Ligand binder design. Structure first.
Ligand SMILES: CC(=O)SCCNC(=O)CCNC(=O)[C@H](O)C(C)(C)COP(=O)(O)OP(=O)(O)OC[C@H]1O[C@@H](n2cnc3c(N)ncnc32)[C@H](O)[C@@H]1OP(=O)(O)O
Ligand SMILES: CC(=O)SCCNC(=O)CCNC(=O)[C@H](O)C(C)(C)COP(=O)(O)OP(=O)(O)OC[C@H]1O[C@@H](n2cnc3c(N)ncnc32)[C@H](O)[C@@H]1OP(=O)(O)O
Ligand SMILES: [Cl-]
Lengths: 179, 181
């Protein structure tokens, strides 16, 4: 059975391999050239420095996928809004590993006191698995930026979905998370 | 009132632009900043937009800058290279006079000329900032989403309203080379 745990620096090689394959063959990522392992490490060190959780799914000593949270935008009024990203190795897809990862990410983001979790889903018309995954964990549709991306010779839509946490906007906020 | 003219931003405009933005940050929820940036930070932001190649425009009458508008990236990853975002701020005593429309119309023309295919408006506190929504509707932007409770400012939860305008055919044809390449 797979376990969800925190990202550890030794994972960065596999995670680069997982993300590299997503960049090259998929449209969930709007990057075109795969980042280097060092660049991936710098990106993850910035997230952790901000205080955001970075999680990996591991079975039989191998990293099956990863998910992390970050800011949608950084201006201070946005400080109760987080964004999720999740990538699963192709040989591990369709096994329930995405939902396990995202379920735990929601719990961590919720405990940090965020009020909204945003999915910015690249090529949402085509990446049905991403939309279904988020619907299955209670995200609701909140917008669609048409023709926001062009990659592999076609236009891509960005599907936006959000999940309220800790009462959402119906209650007064607490202190800023990560403050 | 003398007709405002639209021209490219000049570095010496930054003092007035900072004054305009400061008043908006302090008294309004269109911006999700809380503490107003300094004039030197504003200068650095505008230099960076201009370095990327984005147009920055001001409306000027009787020697005074009455408002400004600029474009920038929504997000910087390469597949987004045909998507731009607009920002526009008008001085309080110049609002409701068509200056926002004059500036945004010319920004659309300049951004279209660069080969972008979509122009995105990310409107803070859309429930309250009707002027922002109406300005963008009046120039053909269509609603494309609403992030509820995206901001908290001035004691209130705020919704972000998203609107977009296709340019040069939008997503109906293959794009040209990346703008600003
Ligand atoms: C905001 C974001 O990060 S969006 C994701 C961006 N990342 C990518 O696009 C990278 C490539 N894709 C992936 O990494 C993965 O396939 C993901 C993230 C889309 C899903 O991860 P998975 O491990 O495959 O998901 P998991 O097995 O937990 O099931 C996901 C849910 O969506 C459904 N689903 C998963 N894959 C598919 C698919 N290809 N087609 C249709 N439905 C699918 C499942 O049925 C399940 O919901 P259910 O309760 O109705 O059964
Ligand atoms: C993505 C963005 O940048 S959103 C804007 C962010 N900026 C701010 O919030 C700062 C504070 N507000 C402002 O700077 C300005 O008021 C703006 C930019 C929202 C609008 O600019 P203005 O010059 O006031 O608008 P302008 O007079 O040009 O009117 C544009 C259109 O919107 C309409 N409109 C403007 N304000 C309102 C209002 N409060 N209620 C109803 N309609 C309005 C006008 O009737 C006009 O439409 P029409 O030509 O069909 O008659
Ligand atoms: Cl000058």
């Amino acid at each position: 059975m797979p376990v969800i745990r925190d990202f550890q620096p030794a994972d960065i090689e596999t995670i680069t391999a997982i993300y590299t394959q997503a960049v090259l063959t998929g449209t969930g990522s709007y990057e075109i050239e795969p980042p280097t392992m060092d660049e991936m490490a710098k990106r993850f060190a910035a997230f952790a420095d901000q205080g955001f959780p970075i999680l990996v799914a591991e079975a039989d000593g191998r990293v099956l996928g990863y998910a992390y949270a970050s800011y949608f935008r950084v201006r201070p009024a946005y400080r109760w809004l987080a964004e999720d990203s999740i990538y699963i190795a192709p040989d591990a897809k369709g096994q329930g590993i995405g939902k396990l990862l995202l379920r735990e990410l929601i719990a961590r983001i919720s405990a940090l006191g965020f009020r909204q979790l945003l999915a910015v889903i690249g090529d949402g018309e085509h990446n049905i698995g991403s939309v279904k995954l988020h619907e299955s964990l209670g995200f609701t549709h909140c917008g669609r930026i048409e023709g926001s991306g062009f990659k592999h010779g076609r236009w891509l839509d960005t599907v936006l979905m959000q999940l309220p946490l800790n009462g959402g906007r119906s209650t007064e906020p607490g202190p800023s998370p990560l403050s």
